[model samples]
Target: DDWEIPDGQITVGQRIGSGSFGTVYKGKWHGDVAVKMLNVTAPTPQQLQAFKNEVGVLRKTRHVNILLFMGYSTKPQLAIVTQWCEGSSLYHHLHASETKFEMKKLIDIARQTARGMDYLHAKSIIHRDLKSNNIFLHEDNTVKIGDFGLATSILWMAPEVIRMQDSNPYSFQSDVYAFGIVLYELMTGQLPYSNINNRDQIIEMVGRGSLSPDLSKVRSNCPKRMKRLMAECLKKKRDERPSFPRILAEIEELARELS
Candidate 1:
């Protein structure tokens, strides 16, 4: 009910995942929820401010494609609660071993992701980080884009953001570049460049505009439309990337062509 979940009310029962800033826990509130617990033991004012800012962003969302944020608790540890996606992340599903991905299923994933991001832009929030791992799935096929953040995702990250300078602010266009990287993951079941290293290398290769994730994977058995659309998503110039609304239409057409 309320955005401020009472301390004792949330029962964090099991670990769901861990990341750079916090450990996520499977929990209960109105029903099953996931709790992102801040990793800080004794926090500083800066940390407290950052966590609250994170919570503030969550409080603004209510979309099916985007992860649902439920509540927050400061005492009993700094934690933010959200909808539970029991099926794990897109990255895990693709890389965790063997699994059959019907072509229709992959297309649906792209449609819904564009749907989600369009709605996100409608709300004036950029995902900032849109790697496969940040995209959660429930009941095996549902897509929920998280607003939070990443894990050595430089290879998938947009070139402008990697520079981390005043020259460019995070924009919706950058997210589409990341989306292309996730599409590469969905298509190939591997990280964009398994050999990609730190910031410098990523900038060098990605900035060149000629080198990009292996498109050979996306086009191997699929139509040229799908591969071309993905390549457009990763365009070096932010202005060249299609908007999510347009991206959604292309993906819908891809689905129509398939079935």
Candidate 2:
């Protein structure tokens, strides 16, 4: 079931993000709760279904490390509200810091994120848009997951749907794959798909980059155990990748070793 915020119950704030489907705002309710409200008006049948599904899924999920769902507004414009995280995203934080991340902090972040993924995987849900931007980190070192617009595409698709060559139904494996890219991002401040300007250049870079140390070369300060774990997570073959909990356990083990 979907929950919609009562009319005149919440005040909308400035726009935080805008996309094809809706706009997200920084909002508050009764003063204390920080929320994100998305604006939607007479959504298409598919959009309506997706919106309803996300509200239900996000609201019920109770992961300590993942983002919280407070409520939503669907009367005037459909908007999904979630707990507000004030700290910068992992994407912004990596570049902002001068020194390579401390190994312990990195490990903690890995474990936290892996725990979230472990929860999602157990629910048989795929977070299709798992990226550094979608991963919000708080000032207190807490992390919360966000952005479900594309998350449930797989389950929402019709049984007879035919996927194109480059586009396929989302899967738990894809979520794992996205997490792998995020692991790379944590180590290397470079964008995962943008080392070069043109498509040909990018392709060439990815080809040569595949075997190069520069892809996600660990800094001198990083622990060898942590590096090994990150390498294992980023393996190219889908089947070759370890399950989410296995990855989480490995991270915990490496963290203990580093400790």
Candidate 3:
């Protein structure tokens, strides 16, 4: 199902966003279908294989909460085409908004995000990068987890991934850690460890198993259930982390209670 899209079919337009590895363009794939064009580099055989694996994962994955992989191109530049979510990133939805979000709405967003994470875990694909910035929002308020560049910053990535010593440490558990960070972001409307500027210090702290976001700042407004869920996700040991299914169930239950 590798539909190699011709460069002519993809009409790249406005520059929507940019990241460390790629830039996203608000473009169209034939017709008027909004698309996110991602630029990727593939030179060596191993790099090419990595790109192939990513494409395979994207093509095979299909879920309501997951972003749709429409097609890709190899000419001019290596790029991936996906359905562009007009509402923009969930990070913006939370931080850019003037009004405070109700706990019900926030829980609903987290629940939808959990559903997407569950799908990824079932498919045996670790997102590697799961943060509020990577999550997209649709017009209907549905969350679409996108931006699979396979690259992540040290600030948000899991301890094992940061260390890179363990065998296959990047998995559902690592994603759970990031999901907890996202929950904290939604609650506080700020990035985790906003006060810290030194990446080396952050990495050093995480390596010593002494780093964790201060959830106490929002304790007055945040629900105990939500706080508890995040604590479980951000555990230092990966094995102590809850599976996506368990996480999804907990978020859904919270949503029900709030409703």
Candidate 4:
């Protein structure tokens, strides 16, 4: 049965969390459900369309790696309902766990994340933001990608979209770039560009084609092959990176080596 948020019944419960475009609240009509309420009352037409596109993408994507959308509202207010994962985002827990995540666990997450990206690529959906923080991990250690705020209008946003910031832009290559950044964070227990003090420095490095990762900087215990894989993904020349399928295959091989 479709549960409707009764008019004026949005109790404005505790602020569950917030995204780039909205804030979420914990609520109940039948049972506990999470509601994301959009903050932009007067979005530009482009943004309005992006919202609809995001809703459609979330609803259509049904995979273990991707967060499941339970429901949403567009009338009176804009909100989205997703499987309520009470656990905090992966960004919050990466450092807090007593056991520093070994290569095996990190590889597993990378594999699962690759699966989600594969599914999105197959469906021609590009999740513009693919960072560790965007991943929500449950008590069971299950992970799902979230934060559709930067969900692009087209799939496989091209390098130009990131460069020219132009139309109908997407490419698996861009996803590969984000994946590289995320994997670096995973293995290092540090944020991508952690040493960079400001965005200007970040931009300067990226512009100078000096942004490639130094595998030696990865945790000392991290395997040589795994470091190599990260190196493959972090290549500054986008063309140097392998496709998702290729990356997945390599990771699976690495996992077997661990086994």
> Which tens-of-lDDT digit does each residue in 40-139 have in candidate 2?
4466777777678777778768787778877776677666667666787776677655535676787788778999988988887777677777777877
The residue pairs in collision within model 3 are: none
What's the number of clashes in each of the models?
0, 2, 0, 6
How accurate locally, in lDDT, is each candidate? 0.78, 0.64, 0.76, 0.69
Candidate with better TM-score, 1 vs 4: 1
Q: Candidate 1: minimum summed lDDT over ten consecutive residues — where?
A: 147-156
Candidate 4 Cα errors over 4 Å, as ranges: 1-12, 39-47, 95-99, 148-162, 165-169
213-250 in candidate 3: lDDT tens per residue? 88775546667888898888988788989998999988
lDDT (Cα, tens digit) per residue for candidate 4, span 1-259: 4534456544446887675667778776456666777667755676567567667777778899888777766666676676666675666777555546656777788888888788888888777667766777766377788773432321112234445555544467777878877787788877655666776665546645565455556788777777887877767566887788888888888888888
Better of 1 and 3 by TM-score: 1
| TM-score of every candidate relative to the true structure | 0.88, 0.79, 0.85, 0.82
- Put down candidate 1 lDDT per residue, 1-259, tens digits, no spaces: 4678777898887777777567788888878888887767776776687677887777877888888888888888888888876686777778874776887888788788888888888788887778887877778878888854523267777877766657665898898888878777777667776666565766777756546887666636665787888888888788999888888888888889888
For candidate 1, what is the lDDT?
0.78
Q: What is the C-alpha RMSD of each candidate to the true structure, in Å?
A: 2.6, 5.2, 3.0, 4.1
Error of 1 at 256 (Å): 2.0
TM-score-based ranking, best first? 1, 3, 4, 2
